[PDB]
Write a protein that holds these residues in place. Sequence first.
Motif, short mmCIF file in Angstrom:
data_model
loop_
_atom_site.label_atom_id
_atom_site.label_comp_id
_atom_site.label_asym_id
_atom_site.label_seq_id
_atom_site.Cartn_x
_atom_site.Cartn_y
_atom_site.Cartn_z
N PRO A 110 -4.91 -2.34 -6.99
CA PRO A 110 -4.69 -0.89 -7.08
C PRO A 110 -3.49 -0.56 -7.94
O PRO A 110 -2.59 -1.37 -8.15
N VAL A 142 -0.11 1.65 -8.50
CA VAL A 142 0.93 2.26 -7.69
C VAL A 142 1.91 2.96 -8.61
O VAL A 142 2.54 2.32 -9.46
N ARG A 199 -10.19 7.23 -6.69
CA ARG A 199 -9.57 8.25 -5.85
C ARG A 199 -8.08 7.96 -5.70
O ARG A 199 -7.67 6.80 -5.59
N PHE A 250 -4.26 8.79 -3.71
CA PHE A 250 -3.75 9.05 -2.37
C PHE A 250 -2.23 9.11 -2.42
O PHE A 250 -1.59 8.16 -2.88
N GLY A 305 1.64 9.93 -0.43
CA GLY A 305 2.28 9.50 0.80
C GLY A 305 1.91 8.09 1.19
O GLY A 305 1.75 7.80 2.39
N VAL A 306 1.76 7.19 0.21
CA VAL A 306 1.38 5.82 0.51
C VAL A 306 2.49 5.13 1.31
O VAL A 306 3.64 5.57 1.35
N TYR A 307 2.12 4.03 1.95
CA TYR A 307 3.03 3.24 2.78
C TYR A 307 2.95 1.79 2.32
O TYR A 307 2.40 0.92 3.01
N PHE A 319 3.69 -1.98 1.66
CA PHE A 319 4.45 -3.10 2.18
C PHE A 319 3.75 -4.38 1.75
O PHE A 319 2.57 -4.38 1.40
N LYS A 330 0.54 -1.06 7.30
CA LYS A 330 1.83 -1.37 6.70
C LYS A 330 1.68 -1.82 5.26
O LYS A 330 2.31 -1.26 4.35
N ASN A 331 0.83 -2.81 5.02
CA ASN A 331 0.78 -3.45 3.72
C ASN A 331 -0.10 -2.66 2.76
O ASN A 331 -0.77 -1.69 3.12
N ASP A 336 2.92 4.56 10.53
CA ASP A 336 3.58 4.89 9.27
C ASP A 336 5.00 5.39 9.49
O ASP A 336 5.85 5.26 8.60
#
Lengths: 49, 49, 52, 265, 49
Positions: free
Chosen positions: A9, A11, A30, A32, A34-36, A38, B32-33, D87
């Motif tokens: 993906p 980023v 698509r 997105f 507010g990604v998280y 890690f 998380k990841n 999150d």
Amino acid sequence: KFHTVVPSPQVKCCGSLECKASSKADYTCRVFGGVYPFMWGGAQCFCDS
Amino acid sequence: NPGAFGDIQASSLDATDIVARTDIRLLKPSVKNIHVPYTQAVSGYEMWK
Amino acid sequence: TPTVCPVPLAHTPTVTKWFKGITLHLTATRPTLLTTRKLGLRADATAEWITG
Amino acid sequence: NSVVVSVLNISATLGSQAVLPCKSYRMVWTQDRLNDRQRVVHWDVYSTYYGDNKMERLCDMYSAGDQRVYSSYNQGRIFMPQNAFTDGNFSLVIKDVAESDGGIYSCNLHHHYCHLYETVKIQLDVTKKAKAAKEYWDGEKAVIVALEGSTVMLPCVNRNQIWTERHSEEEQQVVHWDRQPPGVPHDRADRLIDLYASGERRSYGPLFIRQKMNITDTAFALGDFSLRISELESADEGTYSCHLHHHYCGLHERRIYQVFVTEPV
Amino acid sequence: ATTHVTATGSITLHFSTSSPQANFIVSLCGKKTTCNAECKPPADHIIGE
């Protein structure tokens, strides 16, 4: 029998980006926010969500 | 037509140009990841088989 | 002890068109429990197990 | 790696008793057999518009719990994404905002076991004209202005490892009292005594010095790891270090005391 | 429920009905007025709203 493609993906950190189509058959795209992100190496990049 | 015979179609076996639709929907990141959850219908070839 | 646990999210079905009705092309890979009921006076409770 | 909480020079007198006060009631260990394994977050608004001008709690999320709305209306109006609990984005959503809804918001986190809590403050305002509807940041707080009845969002994210889910096995909170031998630089001490959260204590060196090295039997519980050394001897001369680590809460601290034996004067 | 008023302005309105014979009386400000029309069934015939 087919196989789905799961490419790496994209980023964009602490900024913006827009979706773009692709000539590949049965393509899907698509965005997105507010990604998280890690990883074993940790938070890939840094900005307050 | 997803979930049917001949879901993936091509003029030749090794044709670079392909056309197909099998109802792929992206899922928002939820862990998380970094991960890309993809949801798709079962392949129609094995179905007809 | 109670604790948080994960559960799968099944492939959401496809809603079709039918006069005074609905036809659903349900897709799944493992056994799953489906149910529904009318919102009127008659409960019309319906439950079923779907394998494929 | 621990962080030096403080460095103090101890003029321990030979023969007398010296005290190293290394301790923290925050480090206190829960006494009941059921140590708390849950954490809570909540949102509370202090709108001076109310004549009562009190603070009212909109909603609260419990770890491994179910979303529960204090009142009968905030359901639907208040949206707290369940997945966001992982999150950490403990944000709040309002569907429609009224003139009586604007005021002061506060997002609060509480944890009984770790005894750590935090609060963040925000301001919300509503206007009839969208021309003045613009957020701004005041450093100490954020002010939101939006049209009446318009959907609005208030962010509360901490991005902390402790506040995000980690079902790590509860490692005993290691406590180490280690004394540098005489004429030895710091960080070269040999553990005089070790203390576990379970209450078991591992003694090192002579038993008589350990007995005179009085430590309260409830130190693991009360957290009073202060070291009381009696009948001071020249052997006891040297720097002392009190190390504490809590894996579950992730805390890591060390207290260094320059303990030198001084003859009576 | 309410709207601005000008000297000779004209404004639209959104509404719903439970009958195809759209004949009724509606009041603007204090005054009343009759208004009639006929409505057709829709193409889509399943909705949960």
